[PDB]
Amino acid sequence: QPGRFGDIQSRTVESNDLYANTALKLARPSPGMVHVPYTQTPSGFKYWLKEKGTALNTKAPFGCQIKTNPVRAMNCAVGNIPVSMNLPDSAFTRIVE
C-alpha cells in the first residue's frame, strides 16, 4: 500500500522484476510553460525509517544481545544442556596410589 512499508517490492536485490504502487498521478500543465506537473505520495521506506519504533536489541527477554549477518542471539541463558561423556582409563588413578 502506498505511503507505508513495502510500497515498492523486489524479489531480490539484483532481480529485474518490480512491483510499485505509489499512486503516481499526472496533471494538466499550466498555460504558457513546459514543466510536466505531477503528484505522488511520499516514499514509504523513508517513513518507516522515522517511525519503526523500538527494536529487538532493546526488547529481547533473558538478556541476550541480538546481532546481524548472520542473524543470531548470543549468550541467552535458558534451559539445561545434557552432557554425555566417555573417558579412558588413563584419566583415573588407582585407589592404592
Partner: protein, 49 residues
Amino acid sequence: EYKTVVPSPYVKCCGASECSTKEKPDYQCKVYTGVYPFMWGGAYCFCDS
C-alpha cells in the same frame, strides 16, 4: 527508496499524438490538447490552438 523518472515532454504541434502503453512499473501517460508553450526566445508551434 524509489525514484521517479520523468522524461521530457514531446510537444507535437500542428498535429496530434496518441498515448502508447508500456510494461513499466506504475507507468502513467496522458495527452493534452490546446497547449501554447513558450521558450526564452519566444513561442514556437505556430498553430494557435
